[model samples]
Target chain A: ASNFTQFVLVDNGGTGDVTVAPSNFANGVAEWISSNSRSQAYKVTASVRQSSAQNRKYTIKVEVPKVAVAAWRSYLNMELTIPIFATNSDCELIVKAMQGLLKDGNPIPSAIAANSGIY
Target chain B: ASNFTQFVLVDNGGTGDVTVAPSNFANGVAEWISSNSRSQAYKVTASVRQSSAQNRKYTIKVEVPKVAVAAWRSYLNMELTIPIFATNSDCELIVKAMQGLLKDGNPIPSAIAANSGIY
Candidate 1:
């Protein structure tokens, strides 16, 4: 059961405690868990710790579990959250699941306008 | 046989229950069921329930489901709560679906600061 994976990408949000774990990032690695529930797919390995400055950015690569994604049942709603454009440094936020899709053309909607905070 | 379509631009929350329901609403006509189980397509009848008060911010026109969303076959995770601002008042929670890219991509991850409850 080793069908899991991880994607490494960069994010520019400025210094903040914005931490993105494997549990909330949509379309990152959690999909592996949902798509392959029977098997232990992935885990969060080397994650880029959140920045301590406002508008600071970081790079991330999430690990996935080991399970056949296709074997996942349909009709289920998957969710992810990324720390997108947050407000300050002490509180890092994320967009998490704003961009993740399904085999049926369904995707997690964006919570941008609705996701904002002030330090 | 309406593939089901309802998007009223009302939003903006206010003082209370923030009610919306299919069993409670009598508009939009509920629509239709889409896709199919490979054949069921979609259903949203005009006279349906409000998307619900799961989140509570108040969305345009607002809508309730005639039925909750479909359940997943493989993993089994379904959620549709909308109100992100408040803790109790579900503001027309929607999106139910995050977006990213895949066939191969980084999708849904985990939570932030631990989505702890006010409890």
Candidate 2:
């Protein structure tokens, strides 16, 4: 990869420093990866559905290495969907939310973790 | 879809005012849609591979709707690759380059269009 912008991530807003690698930036979707661990790697992707009939749909996906044998699966993913009309302020809020989650080292906060359905 | 940002595009830098629909914002990947015409719709996606042996790989893909039968294909696409070390200034240059191409409505300029291999 070339021409990427690097951003640093401090796990739990403390130790375990990780770097977010860059990729080509499309108009509204963005993706990157976190430093890999022995057991798994983190893949982060975000996308918006701006032209849908329902309005604007924003999605953030956090994917980690999964163990799979043939077809068996083990990787767990967490997705957050926010539906609202598009606006600069709203976009900023979403960005901050993603940054906050990444910094805290918790993709799903305890408040909604259980019901998030991917336990 | 919700919480998306909208940007307008002028085809041929003139008529055809197409609005680029937004998707979620991934770390470095961005995607959007252009208003559909009678025969096809335009899709644009850009991605970056920040951690690779080659340093950084940036890819921009422009895809159009294809008519497929059982397994046949009809859509056409153009992609551009730029590999270079990551830097802020370089990133801006790339952005400007993309904007320049979009403004011109030519994914591949005439000079390299033939060698681009997908004429």
On TM-score, the leading prediction is: 2
Classify candidate 1 by CAPRI docking class.
Answer: incorrect
- Runs in model 2 with CA error above 4 Å? A1-119, B1-4, B9-15, B24-29, B35-39, B65-85, B94-108, B111-119
DockQ of 2: 0.02
Clashes of each: 109, 31
> What is candidate 1's CA lDDT for residue A55?
21
TM-score for each predicted model, relative to the true structure: 0.24, 0.30
| Error of model 2, residue A97, in angstroms | 33
Candidate 2 lDDT tens digits, A1-119: 22223444213334643444544357655555655643444444444454645334433333333323211111222222223332343333332322222121221121111111101
Which candidate wins on DockQ?
Answer: 1
Candidate 1 chain B superposition, TM-score: 0.22
What TM-score against the true chain A does chain A of each candidate get?
0.22, 0.45
